[PDB]
Design a protein around this ligand. Structure first.
Ligand SMILES: [Ca+2]
Length: 223
């Protein structure tokens, strides 16, 4: 997160870190046994880390649970990033509490102008590299489909939306991938892609979660 703020420990209780020896992507807890992330975050050997603030210190609210199964969206295209979504099932159920909590899935899509909270442990510089230890947060609005398409000609599908600031300076970044975009208490987006970070006229691009709720619910019901 570039241009954001320190969230505060466990104030984003559905935020997870995906760990394969090191943090490499975010995710969102959607029930006691399932996590939603970005397909481009797929790898084997995932440990899900719940309850994290400082990802380099054991502070007392963590739950570390191995993935038992990963399911990349059937139609994921790694070249275009269309359908950049994946589900991860935990080997055991998380113990849900005030600091480790699921986020509601949307019943309807969000609209341009709605404010949302984006979070993660990704890079905090746009012309630099600095990775935070504690969770960072950014409040940002959804942008219109037309301004999204104008920012990224020929690249925005119906499964993508833009959010952030055309002026630059405030965005998600490398290492935030897979993490949440939550709007009015609903998971509406997944950190997916963008040209650099926090660059003028190059807002973040997010997977549009509302398009996937049918797939998510049926997948959970059969696995
Ligand atoms: Ca920790």
């Amino acid at each position: 997160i570039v241009g954001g703020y320190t969230c505060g420990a466990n104030t984003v209780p559905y935020q997870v870190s995906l760990n394969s020896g090191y943090h490499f992507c975010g995710g969102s807890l959607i029930n006691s046994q399932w996590v939603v992330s970005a397909a481009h975050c797929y790898k084997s050997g995932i440990q899900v880390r719940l309850g994290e603030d400082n990802i380099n210190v054991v502070e007392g609210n963590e739950q570390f649970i191995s993935a038992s199964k990963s399911i990349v969206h059937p139609s994921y295209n790694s070249n275009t990033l269309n359908n950049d979504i994946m589900l991860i099932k935990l080997k055991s159920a998380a113990s849900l509490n005030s600091r480790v909590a699921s986020i509601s899935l949307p019943t309807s899509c969000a609209s341009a102008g709605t404010q949302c909270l984006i979070s993660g442990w990704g890079n905090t510089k746009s012309s630099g590299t600095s990775y935070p230890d504690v969770l960072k947060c950014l409040k940002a609005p959804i942008l219109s489909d037309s301004s999204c398409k104008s920012a990224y000609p020929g690249q925005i599908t119906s499964n993508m939306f833009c959010a952030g600031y055309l002026e630059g300076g405030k965005d998600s970044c490398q290492g935030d991938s897979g993490g949440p975009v939550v709007c009015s208490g609903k998971l509406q987006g997944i950190v997916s892609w963008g040209s650099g970070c926090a660059q003028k006229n190059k807002p973040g691009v997010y997977t549009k979660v509302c398009n996937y709720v049918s797939w998510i619910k049926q997948t959970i019901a059969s696995n």
